[PDB]
Amino acid sequence: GTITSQDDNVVVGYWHNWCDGRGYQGGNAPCVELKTVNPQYNVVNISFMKVYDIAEGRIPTFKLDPTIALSEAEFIAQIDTLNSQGRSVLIALGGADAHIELTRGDEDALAAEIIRLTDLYGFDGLDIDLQQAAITAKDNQFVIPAALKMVKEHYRKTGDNFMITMAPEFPYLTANGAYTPYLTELDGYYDFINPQFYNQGGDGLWIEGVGWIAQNNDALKEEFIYYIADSLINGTRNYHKIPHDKLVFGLPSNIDAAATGYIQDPQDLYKAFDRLKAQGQPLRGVMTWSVNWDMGTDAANNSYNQQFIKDYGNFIHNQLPPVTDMTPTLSGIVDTRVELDSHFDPLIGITAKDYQGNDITADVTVSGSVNTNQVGDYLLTYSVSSDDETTNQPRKITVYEILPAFTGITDTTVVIDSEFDPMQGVSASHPTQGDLTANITVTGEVDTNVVGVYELTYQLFYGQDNQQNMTDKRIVTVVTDAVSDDDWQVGSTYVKDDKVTHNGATWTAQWWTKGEEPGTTGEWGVWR
Numbered sequence: 001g002t003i004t005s006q007d008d009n010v011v012v013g014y015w016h017n018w019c020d021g022r023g024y025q026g027g028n029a030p031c032v033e034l035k036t037v038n039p040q041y042n043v044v045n046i047s048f049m050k051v052y053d054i055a056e057g058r059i060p061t062f063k064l065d066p067t068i069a070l071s072e073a074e075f076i077a078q079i080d081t082l083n084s085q086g087r088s089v090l091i092a093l094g095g096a097d098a099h100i101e102l103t104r105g106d107e108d109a110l111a112a113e114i115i116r117l118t119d120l121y122g123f124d125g126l127d128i129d130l131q132q133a134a135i136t137a138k139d140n141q142f143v144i145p146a147a148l149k150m151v152k153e154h155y156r157k158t159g160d161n162f163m164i165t166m167a168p169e170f171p172y173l174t175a176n177g178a179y180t181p182y183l184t185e186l187d188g189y190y191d192f193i194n195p196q197f198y199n200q201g202g203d204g205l206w207i208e209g210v211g212w213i214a215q216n217n218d219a220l221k222e223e224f225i226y227y228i229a230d231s232l233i234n235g236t237r238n239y240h241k242i243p244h245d246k247l248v249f250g251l252p253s254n255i256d257a258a259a260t261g262y263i264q265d266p267q268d269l270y271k272a273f274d275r276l277k278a279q280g281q282p283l284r285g286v287m288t289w290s291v292n293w294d295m296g297t298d299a300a301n302n303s304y305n306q307q308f309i310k311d312y313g314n315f316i317h318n319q320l321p322p323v324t325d326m327t328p329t330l331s332g333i334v335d336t337r338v339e340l341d342s343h344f345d346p347l348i349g350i351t352a353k354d355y356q357g358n359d360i361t362a363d364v365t366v367s368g369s370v371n372t373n374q375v376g377d378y379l380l381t382y383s384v385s386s387d388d389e390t391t392n393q394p395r396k397i398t399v400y401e402i403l404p405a406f407t408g409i410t411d412t413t414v415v416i417d418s419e420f421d422p423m424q425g426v427s428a429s430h431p432t433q434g435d436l437t438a439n440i441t442v443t444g445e446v447d448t449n450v451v452g453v454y455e456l457t458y459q460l461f462y463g464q465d466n467q468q469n470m471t472d473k474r475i476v477t478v479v480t481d482a483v484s485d486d487d488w489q490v491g492s493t494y495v496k497d498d499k500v501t502h503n504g505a506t507w508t509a510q511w512w513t514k515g516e517e518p519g520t521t522g523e524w525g526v527w528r
């Protein structure tokens with residue numbers, strides 16, 4: 001069949017390219033034929049395209065597991081059957097424990113392989129399900145989006161919408177998180193995102209005013225679904241924005257399918273989705289790992305018997321078609337610190353796209369202004385409008401100054417009659433003004449002919465018109481070279497006529513002494 005895409009809500013189910021997968025609670029997921037998957041799964045994701053063996057190179061591929069007992073041709077035929085029913089069959093890239101590591105330049109070969117597989121099997125698109133290191137390995141965050149843009153454009157030439165979806169684990173969807181390169185580079189290209197709201201334990205989000213709402217909290221599941229979706233579809237609470245018409249809520253089919261995240265009471269989902277509809281932002285569907293688990297068994301060999309599709313198929317399909325959120329995006333805006341008097345260009349690094357991913361950078365306007373000749377904060381607001389919508393974002397620009405620094409102003413002792421130059425070895429620097437040594441003045445003098453302690457005050461003048469100042473003090477001690485009688489020591493023994501220096505004077509012992517301080521023994525004592 002032909003490239004078959006979905007214009008309305010979706011119930012997405014992954015399909016295991018393997019048999020008898022073990023459950024987190026000891027159950028079993030059989031392989032199943034595609035033709036047996038419930039019709040209400042209108043998107044079925046073949047899992048997974050990956051690197052099967054590094055000896056075939058870096059480019060991932062898909063290899064049907066023959067033990068499912070579908071020949072290549074029969075598998076093809078069953079995809080065609082789904083397509084004839086108006087259902088989409090995507091290829092899912094990655095999965096758990098799949099390492100993919102591509103280098104800049106690999107994009108052409110990756111696109112070529114996606115096209116080859118797509119044309120051979122009749123796939124309708126690709127789901128990005130990179131996990132763990134594969135999300136950020138080498139140049140993946142560049143190569144995979146680059147390849148996918150090529151694939152999208154290739155099929156657009158013939159009037160076909162090759163679907164692009166993604167299945168990020170939700171924690172990666174913070175505003176600057178690991179998936180954000182895939183989301184931004186593919187804005188306009190992707191059909192919807194179905195994040196995984198499972199296998200993350202106690203992770204979740206903080207709602208100012210209700211507290212922490214965790215993905216494994218079964219008492220607050222309605223609030224979990226509502227608030228995490230609300231944050232995604234509006235770009236609030238530190239999440240990257242995924243428009244509501246493009247957000248599909250990914251879930252485990254049952255307790256065997258994922259460690260945590262199963263919805264015990266489907267009412268919690270119905271109500272959360274209704275609340276999102278009530279604020280004008282209905283979601284685009286649900287997704288599940290997996291149709292195999294939905295048709296699987298538990299540890300007691302009891303059948304799950306399609307409970308997931310029973311709970312959610314009709315609820316999600318019995319909804320109005322999606323209404324596109326046509327708001328444009330701005331990229332590259334970050335609060336920036338600028339050194340006093342440096343040049344600042346408010347447009348550099350900032351771009352914009354309409355909701356279809358067309359570049360509309362030239363249409364960005366900025367209000368506010370920065371005065372780099374004055375330290376302080378300056379607030380800019382960037383705006384762009386397209387498609388009867390507007391997006392705005394602020395940017396704080398802080399102008400700061402750095403103090404210069406002196407070198408070589410350290411206390412020093414010099415010998416009598418030596419030459420002393422107060423500027424020898426003395427300098428000052430500043431990162432933008434450069435060498436400021438010629439801007440140093442010296443208050444005070446050293447007289448090296450006269451023993452004693454001389455204070456010098458160094459002043460540095462700098463900045464505009466040399467009206468900024470900083471000061472540092474230096475002590476220069478001039479000492480004689482003259483040989484003196486050895487210093488008195490409290491523990492030494494002296495006898496008549498021994499001489500000692502103490503407290504600035506030379507004293508002579510008049511008899512035997514130990515422990516008596518010169519100067520403290522009066523008019524007629526041992527030291528004179």
Ligand SMILES: CC(=O)N[C@@H]1[C@@H](O)[C@H](O[C@@H]2O[C@H](CO)[C@@H](O[C@@H]3O[C@H](CO)[C@@H](O[C@@H]4O[C@H](CO)[C@@H](O)[C@H](O)[C@H]4NC(C)=O)[C@H](O)[C@H]3NC(C)=O)[C@H](O)[C@H]2NC(C)=O)[C@@H](CO)O[C@H]1O
Nearest residue numbers: 021022023024095096097167169171196198199257258289
């Ligand atoms: C942010 C972070 O680091 N989170 C950690 C979790 O990542 C981690 O648990 C892993 O969670 C992922 C994300 O859900 C999960 O992978 C998805 O989930 C299903 C299982 O629920 C995977 O199914 C397995 O696929 C492999 C083939 O790739 C099969 O070999 C295996 O039999 C499948 N298991 C079952 C029960 O069917 C999917 O591949 C995958 N994608 C989708 C769309 O669902 C991993 O399996 C989880 N890994 C483990 C070891 O549990 C968690 C625990 O380590 O820690 C979080 O911090």
Ligand code: NA
Nearest residue numbers: 002003122123
């Ligand atoms: Na097809």
